[PDB]
Write an enzyme that holds these catalytic residues in place. Structure first.
Site, mmCIF file in Angstrom:
data_model
loop_
_atom_site.group_PDB
_atom_site.id
_atom_site.type_symbol
_atom_site.label_atom_id
_atom_site.label_comp_id
_atom_site.label_asym_id
_atom_site.label_seq_id
_atom_site.Cartn_x
_atom_site.Cartn_y
_atom_site.Cartn_z
ATOM 1 N N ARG A 172 0.845 -1.194 0.000
ATOM 2 C CA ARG A 172 0.000 0.000 0.000
ATOM 3 C C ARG A 172 0.889 1.256 0.000
ATOM 4 O O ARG A 172 0.779 2.096 0.904
ATOM 5 C CB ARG A 172 -0.843 -0.027 1.271
ATOM 6 N N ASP A 237 -1.369 -8.803 5.799
ATOM 7 C CA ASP A 237 -2.614 -8.404 5.094
ATOM 8 C C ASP A 237 -3.650 -9.518 5.018
ATOM 9 O O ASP A 237 -4.858 -9.248 5.053
ATOM 10 C CB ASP A 237 -2.336 -7.910 3.683
ATOM 11 N N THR A 238 -3.183 -10.755 4.900
ATOM 12 C CA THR A 238 -4.116 -11.875 4.874
ATOM 13 C C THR A 238 -4.951 -11.922 6.169
ATOM 14 O O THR A 238 -6.172 -12.006 6.116
ATOM 15 C CB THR A 238 -3.390 -13.233 4.717
ATOM 16 N N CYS A 343 0.034 -22.707 2.590
ATOM 17 C CA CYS A 343 0.404 -21.745 3.632
ATOM 18 C C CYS A 343 1.148 -22.342 4.835
ATOM 19 O O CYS A 343 0.601 -23.175 5.561
ATOM 20 C CB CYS A 343 -0.855 -21.047 4.145
ATOM 21 N N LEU A 344 2.374 -21.880 5.057
ATOM 22 C CA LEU A 344 3.128 -22.284 6.259
ATOM 23 C C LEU A 344 2.534 -21.732 7.550
ATOM 24 O O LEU A 344 2.663 -22.357 8.624
ATOM 25 C CB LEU A 344 4.589 -21.835 6.136
ATOM 26 N N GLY A 345 1.861 -20.588 7.443
ATOM 27 C CA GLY A 345 1.206 -19.968 8.587
ATOM 28 C C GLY A 345 -0.202 -20.430 8.897
ATOM 29 O O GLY A 345 -0.866 -19.821 9.739
HETATM 30 C C1 HEM Z 1 -6.019 -16.053 6.937
HETATM 31 C C2 HEM Z 1 -4.689 -15.875 6.842
HETATM 32 C C3 HEM Z 1 -3.808 -16.462 5.710
HETATM 33 C C4 HEM Z 1 -4.163 -16.856 4.481
HETATM 34 C C5 HEM Z 1 -5.572 -16.828 3.850
HETATM 35 C C6 HEM Z 1 -2.987 -17.320 3.794
HETATM 36 C C7 HEM Z 1 -2.939 -17.815 2.510
HETATM 37 C C8 HEM Z 1 -1.818 -18.327 1.898
HETATM 38 C C9 HEM Z 1 -1.787 -18.961 0.605
HETATM 39 C C10 HEM Z 1 -2.996 -19.136 -0.303
HETATM 40 C C11 HEM Z 1 -0.544 -19.333 0.324
HETATM 41 C C12 HEM Z 1 -0.042 -20.054 -0.962
HETATM 42 C C13 HEM Z 1 0.272 -19.047 -2.068
HETATM 43 C C14 HEM Z 1 0.605 -19.760 -3.370
HETATM 44 O O1 HEM Z 1 0.484 -21.008 -3.492
HETATM 45 O O2 HEM Z 1 0.995 -19.041 -4.329
HETATM 46 C C15 HEM Z 1 0.267 -18.958 1.449
HETATM 47 C C16 HEM Z 1 1.619 -19.167 1.540
HETATM 48 C C17 HEM Z 1 2.390 -18.752 2.579
HETATM 49 N N1 HEM Z 1 1.954 -18.147 3.766
HETATM 50 FE FE1 HEM Z 1 0.007 -17.731 4.245
HETATM 51 N N2 HEM Z 1 -1.910 -17.174 4.643
HETATM 52 C C18 HEM Z 1 -2.373 -16.694 5.839
HETATM 53 C C19 HEM Z 1 -1.621 -16.456 6.973
HETATM 54 C C20 HEM Z 1 -0.262 -16.621 7.059
HETATM 55 C C21 HEM Z 1 0.540 -16.408 8.262
HETATM 56 C C22 HEM Z 1 -0.112 -16.024 9.606
HETATM 57 C C23 HEM Z 1 1.836 -16.595 7.950
HETATM 58 C C24 HEM Z 1 3.115 -16.472 8.835
HETATM 59 C C25 HEM Z 1 3.098 -16.440 10.157
HETATM 60 C C26 HEM Z 1 1.882 -16.967 6.558
HETATM 61 C C27 HEM Z 1 3.005 -17.255 5.824
HETATM 62 C C28 HEM Z 1 3.035 -17.854 4.589
HETATM 63 C C29 HEM Z 1 4.248 -18.268 3.925
HETATM 64 C C30 HEM Z 1 5.674 -18.146 4.502
HETATM 65 C C31 HEM Z 1 3.825 -18.890 2.595
HETATM 66 C C32 HEM Z 1 4.690 -19.491 1.456
HETATM 67 C C33 HEM Z 1 4.738 -21.012 1.558
HETATM 68 C C34 HEM Z 1 5.566 -21.547 0.400
HETATM 69 O O3 HEM Z 1 5.749 -20.856 -0.627
HETATM 70 O O4 HEM Z 1 6.024 -22.705 0.535
HETATM 71 N N3 HEM Z 1 0.600 -16.960 6.037
HETATM 72 N N4 HEM Z 1 -0.534 -18.349 2.389
#
Ligand code: HEM
Length: 400
Positions: A172, A237-238, A343-345
């Protein structure tokens, strides 16, 4: 504004959906995207918006493309065609980086952190409670995940507004910093901390990452900063926008609100159903080769939008998909993604959501959208809520 149609793309598959400004946005962002699931729309379409790209519109194709990493590469994970976070764009290596990231945000860590997360949620809610009003997005949603990151990473509270400023600039920008400048400033911040914790580690996420191993050797500073940067920005942001869609719905649906007040044991299930209904991410992939996919000729280099948001909204996956029902026996979704990049998170996020809902509903059970307010959504790679003005009577709340 429309890119010229490539000659391999048949005209009957053309549907000019703009993921950054969809036609029916005022009616709700998920509703605006679900136009792609109307009966006159094929399972796989081409839009000329935003450079021109494929869109898979159904959960079956979205899942399959995320499974087939050999054809659908993360090398270019965003539409439209300086982003270098790890492992977003990366298999033996991806798997090693994911395993390391899993050590720092996996279930055992989240279980250890849960009560700290609750304490944080409690202090934020208690600070707003007597006011009888807030902009939920700004006053609770924005400050919560960044504070959880500081807990996770063992970073001082004092560093929040500057870190939050850099991450705000990446998504943003106000114009003070380019994406590349914001990213490098984030790296300027992380690198010294990574190096210090390499030599003198704690049990925080940065210490664990900095001491990790890749390819039988120590993780490099470049690798560690890119991993730490993703762990930071991935959870902001998620979570901000997701919590905001959930709280908008609860504000507007007193009967769903009442259900969770009366039956708090249903909150974990309600969380899953909300994740499905108010799914919000739409990432993509790029073709590694010419490939025929479900009767459609894709060309090497074509980008394809694979909206995580759409799988759970697909009526082929969930009946009456726009209805929220916390008792669904089978909540089918890809809100956290699917395939090797899942998602790792996801575990941290669910705990953040459940803790937030449990604490809000016990302290401020009765709340509404501010009189006169119309909630506006935004669309993009991470769709969201511009602002969420809530009101309540402080006499119906209860203090700590
Ligand atoms: C409602 C909250 C969240 C949603 C909806 C979400 C959604 C996603 C999605 C859809 C992906 C896969 C993207 C892709 O395949 O191109 C992803 C990857 C990832 N997310 Fe989340 N996320 C959330 C919260 C979090 C949190 C809380 C963290 C860290 C504390 C996090 C860290 C990551 C990381 C590091 C990846 C990359 C994994 C990889 O490439 O192997 N996310 N997330």
């Amino acid at each position: 504004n429309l890119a010229p149609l490539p000659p391999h793309v048949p005209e009957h598959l053309v549907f000019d959906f703009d993921m950054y400004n969809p036609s029916n946005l005022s009616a709700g962002v998920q509703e605006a995207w679900a136009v792609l699931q109307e009966s006159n729309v094929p399972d796989l379409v081409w839009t000329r918006c935003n450079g021109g790209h494929w869109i898979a519109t159904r959960g079956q194709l979205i899942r399959e493309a995320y499974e087939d990493y050999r054809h659908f590469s993360s090398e270019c994970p965003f539409i439209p065609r300086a982003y270098d976070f790890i492992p977003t764009s990366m298999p033996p290596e991806q798997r090693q980086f994911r395993a390391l990231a899993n050590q720092v945000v996996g279930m055992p860590v989240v279980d250890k952190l849960e009560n700290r997360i609750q304490e944080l949620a409690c202090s934020l809610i208690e600070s707003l409670r007597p006011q009888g009003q807030c902009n939920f997005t700004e006053d609770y949603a924005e400050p919560f995940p960044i504070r959880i990151f500081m807990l996770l990473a063992g970073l001082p509270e004092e560093d929040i507004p500057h870190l939050k400023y850099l991450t705000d600039q990446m998504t943003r920008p106000d114009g003070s910093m380019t994406f590349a400048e914001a990213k490098e400033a984030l790296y300027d911040y992380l690198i010294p901390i990574i190096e210090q914790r390499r030599q003198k580690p704690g049990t925080d996420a940065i210490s664990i990452v900095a001491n990790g191993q890749v390819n039988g050797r120590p993780i490099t500073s470049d690798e560690a900063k890119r991993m730490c940067g993703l762990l930071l920005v991935g959870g902001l942001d998620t979570v901000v926008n997701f919590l905001s869609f959930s709280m908008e719905f609860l504000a507007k649906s007193p009967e769903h609100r009442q259900e969770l007040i009366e039956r708090p044991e249903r909150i974990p299930a309600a969380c899953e159903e909300l994740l499905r209904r108010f799914s919000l991410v739409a990432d993509g992939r790029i073709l590694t080769s010419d490939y025929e996919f479900h009767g459609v000729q894709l060309k090497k280099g074509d980008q394809i939008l694979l909206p995580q948001m759409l799988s759970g909204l697909d009526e082929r996956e969930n009946a009456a998909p726009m209805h929220v029902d916390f008792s669904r026996q089978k909540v089918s979704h890809t809100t956290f993604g699917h395939g090797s990049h899942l998602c790792l998170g996801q575990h941290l996020a669910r705990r953040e959501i459940i803790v937030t809902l449990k604490e809000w509903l016990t302290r401020i059970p009765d709340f509404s959208i501010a009189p006169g307010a119309q909630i506006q959504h935004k669309s993009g790679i991470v769709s969201g809520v511009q602002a969420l003005p809530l009101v309540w009577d402080p006499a119906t709340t209860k203090a700590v």
